Amino acid sequence: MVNWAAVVDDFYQELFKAHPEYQNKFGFKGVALGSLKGNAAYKTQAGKTVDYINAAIGGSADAAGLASRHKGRNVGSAEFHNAKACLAKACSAHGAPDLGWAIDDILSHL
Ligand code: HEM
């Protein structure tokens, strides 16, 4: 099966490399990027991200609910546009299908 866990790991590496300040909103704030895989808060977040991807593909994802939760953290369309680019890179590195359509679904509620 597609290794979404690896894709998500690359996604977070790209995301926080381009926008380090985004990492301050998470429970793994201040943690060195190359050590995130050993951080408990990160493992949980990454797992939830993998879950969301599988839910989007599976057809059970609640894009409206995810958008509202992100608004609840002062995360908006701009951040999601930035994320879209990082995820596109991360998918490509693993021969995985692109996920822009799923981010578009979220953006449609931001
Ligand atoms: C491809 C784009 C993204 C996806 C698929 C995604 C997915 C998720 C998921 C599944 C959760 C958990 C929600 C829950 O538990 O109900 C979450 C939480 C969160 N997301 Fe994202 N996200 C994305 C982009 C971003 C960006 C760009 C930011 C920028 C700051 C961000 C900030 C957060 C924060 C602060 C949380 C809560 C963390 C915590 O509870 O400690 N997200 N995200």
Side-chain angles (χ1 to χ4, degrees), residues 46-79:
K48 292 198 178 178
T49 307
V50 173
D51 292 348
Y52 187 81
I53 291 171
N54 288 315
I57 296 171
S60 73
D62 178 11
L66 193 66
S68 182
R69 282 162 178 80
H70 283 81
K71 289 187 188 175
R73 303 295 181 134
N74 293 321
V75 180
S77 300
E79 291 89 357

Coordinates of all heavy atoms in Angstrom, one line a residue, residues 46-79:
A46 N 1.4 13.5 13.3 CA 1.6 12.8 12.1 C 0.6 11.7 11.8 O 0.1 11.6 10.7 CB 3.1 12.3 12.1
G47 N 0.3 10.9 12.9 CA -0.7 9.9 12.8 C -2.0 10.4 12.4 O -2.7 9.8 11.5
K48 N -2.4 11.5 13.0 CA -3.7 12.1 12.7 C -3.8 12.6 11.3 O -4.9 12.6 10.6 CB -4.0 13.2 13.7 CG -4.3 12.8 15.1 CD -5.0 13.9 15.9 CE -5.3 13.5 17.3 NZ -5.9 14.6 18.1
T49 N -2.7 13.1 10.8 CA -2.5 13.6 9.4 C -2.7 12.4 8.4 O -3.4 12.5 7.4 CB -1.2 14.3 9.2 OG1 -1.0 15.3 10.2 CG2 -1.1 15.0 7.8
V50 N -2.0 11.3 8.7 CA -2.1 10.1 7.9 C -3.6 9.7 7.9 O -4.1 9.3 6.8 CB -1.2 9.0 8.4 CG1 -1.5 7.7 7.7 CG2 0.3 9.4 8.2
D51 N -4.2 9.7 9.1 CA -5.6 9.3 9.2 C -6.5 10.2 8.3 O -7.3 9.7 7.6 CB -6.1 9.4 10.6 CG -5.5 8.3 11.5 OD1 -4.8 7.3 11.0 OD2 -5.7 8.4 12.8
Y52 N -6.2 11.5 8.3 CA -7.0 12.4 7.5 C -6.9 12.1 6.0 O -7.9 12.1 5.3 CB -6.7 13.9 7.8 CG -7.7 14.7 7.1 CD1 -8.9 15.0 7.6 CD2 -7.4 15.2 5.8 CE1 -9.9 15.7 6.9 CE2 -8.3 16.0 5.1 CZ -9.6 16.2 5.7 OH -10.5 16.9 5.0
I53 N -5.7 11.9 5.6 CA -5.4 11.5 4.2 C -6.2 10.2 3.8 O -6.9 10.2 2.8 CB -4.0 11.3 3.9 CG1 -3.3 12.7 4.0 CG2 -3.8 10.8 2.5 CD1 -1.8 12.7 3.9
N54 N -6.1 9.2 4.6 CA -6.8 8.0 4.4 C -8.4 8.2 4.4 O -9.1 7.5 3.8 CB -6.4 6.8 5.3 CG -5.0 6.3 4.9 OD1 -4.7 6.1 3.8 ND2 -4.1 6.1 5.9
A55 N -8.8 9.1 5.3 CA -10.2 9.4 5.4 C -10.7 10.2 4.1 O -11.7 10.0 3.6 CB -10.5 10.3 6.6
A56 N -9.8 11.1 3.6 CA -10.1 11.8 2.4 C -10.3 10.9 1.2 O -11.2 10.9 0.4 CB -9.1 12.9 2.1
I57 N -9.3 10.0 1.0 CA -9.3 9.0 0.0 C -10.5 8.0 0.2 O -11.1 7.5 -0.8 CB -8.0 8.2 0.0 CG1 -6.8 9.2 -0.4 CG2 -8.0 7.0 -1.0 CD1 -5.5 8.6 -0.3
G58 N -10.7 7.6 1.5 CA -11.8 6.7 1.8 C -13.2 7.2 1.7 O -14.2 6.5 1.5
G59 N -13.3 8.6 1.7 CA -14.6 9.2 1.5 C -15.3 9.6 2.8 O -16.5 10.0 2.8
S60 N -14.6 9.5 4.0 CA -15.2 9.8 5.2 C -14.7 11.1 5.8 O -15.2 11.5 6.9 CB -15.0 8.7 6.2 OG -13.6 8.7 6.6
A61 N -13.8 11.8 5.2 CA -13.2 13.0 5.7 C -14.2 14.1 5.9 O -15.1 14.3 5.0 CB -12.0 13.4 4.9
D62 N -14.1 14.8 7.0 CA -15.0 16.0 7.2 C -14.2 17.2 7.0 O -13.6 17.8 7.9 CB -15.5 15.9 8.7 CG -16.3 17.1 9.0 OD1 -16.7 17.9 8.2 OD2 -16.6 17.2 10.2
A63 N -14.1 17.7 5.7 CA -13.3 18.8 5.3 C -13.8 20.1 6.0 O -13.0 20.9 6.4 CB -13.2 19.0 3.8
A64 N -15.1 20.3 6.1 CA -15.6 21.4 6.8 C -15.2 21.5 8.2 O -14.8 22.5 8.7 CB -17.2 21.4 6.7
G65 N -15.2 20.3 8.9 CA -14.8 20.2 10.3 C -13.3 20.5 10.5 O -12.9 21.1 11.4
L66 N -12.5 20.0 9.6 CA -11.1 20.3 9.6 C -10.8 21.7 9.4 O -9.9 22.3 10.1 CB -10.3 19.4 8.6 CG -8.8 19.4 8.9 CD1 -8.5 18.7 10.2 CD2 -8.0 18.7 7.7
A67 N -11.4 22.3 8.4 CA -11.3 23.8 8.2 C -11.6 24.6 9.4 O -10.9 25.4 9.8 CB -12.1 24.2 7.0
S68 N -12.8 24.3 10.0 CA -13.2 25.0 11.2 C -12.2 24.9 12.4 O -12.0 25.9 13.1 CB -14.6 24.6 11.6 OG -15.1 25.3 12.7
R69 N -11.7 23.7 12.5 CA -10.7 23.5 13.6 C -9.4 24.3 13.3 O -8.8 24.8 14.2 CB -10.4 22.0 13.7 CG -11.4 21.3 14.5 CD -11.3 19.8 14.3 NE -12.4 19.2 15.1 CZ -13.6 19.1 14.8 NH1 -14.1 19.6 13.7 NH2 -14.5 18.4 15.6
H70 N -9.0 24.4 12.0 CA -7.9 25.2 11.7 C -8.1 26.7 11.9 O -7.2 27.4 12.5 CB -7.3 24.9 10.3 CG -6.6 23.6 10.3 ND1 -7.2 22.4 10.2 CD2 -5.3 23.3 10.4 CE1 -6.3 21.4 10.2 NE2 -5.1 22.0 10.4
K71 N -9.3 27.2 11.5 CA -9.6 28.6 11.8 C -9.6 28.8 13.4 O -9.2 29.9 13.8 CB -11.1 28.8 11.4 CG -11.3 28.9 9.9 CD -12.8 29.3 9.7 CE -13.2 29.2 8.2 NZ -14.6 29.5 8.1
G72 N -9.9 27.8 14.1 CA -9.8 27.8 15.6 C -8.4 27.9 16.1 O -8.3 28.2 17.3
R73 N -7.4 27.8 15.3 CA -6.0 27.9 15.6 C -5.4 29.2 14.9 O -4.2 29.3 14.9 CB -5.2 26.7 15.2 CG -5.7 25.4 15.8 CD -5.5 25.4 17.3 NE -6.0 24.1 17.9 CZ -5.3 23.4 18.8 NH1 -4.1 23.9 19.2 NH2 -5.8 22.3 19.2
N74 N -6.3 30.0 14.3 CA -5.8 31.1 13.5 C -5.0 30.7 12.3 O -4.0 31.3 12.0 CB -5.1 32.1 14.3 CG -6.0 32.8 15.3 OD1 -7.2 33.1 15.0 ND2 -5.5 33.1 16.5
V75 N -5.3 29.5 11.7 CA -4.7 29.0 10.5 C -5.7 29.2 9.4 O -6.9 28.7 9.4 CB -4.3 27.6 10.7 CG1 -3.7 27.1 9.4 CG2 -3.4 27.4 11.8
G76 N -5.3 29.8 8.3 CA -6.2 30.2 7.2 C -5.8 29.7 5.8 O -5.0 28.9 5.6
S77 N -6.5 30.4 4.8 CA -6.3 30.0 3.4 C -4.8 30.1 3.0 O -4.3 29.3 2.2 CB -7.2 30.9 2.5 OG -8.5 30.6 2.9
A78 N -4.1 31.2 3.4 CA -2.7 31.4 3.1 C -1.8 30.3 3.5 O -1.1 29.8 2.7 CB -2.3 32.7 3.7
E79 N -2.0 29.9 4.8 CA -1.2 28.7 5.3 C -1.5 27.4 4.5 O -0.6 26.7 4.2 CB -1.5 28.5 6.8 CG -1.0 29.6 7.7 CD -1.9 30.7 7.9 OE1 -3.0 30.8 7.3 OE2 -1.5 31.6 8.7

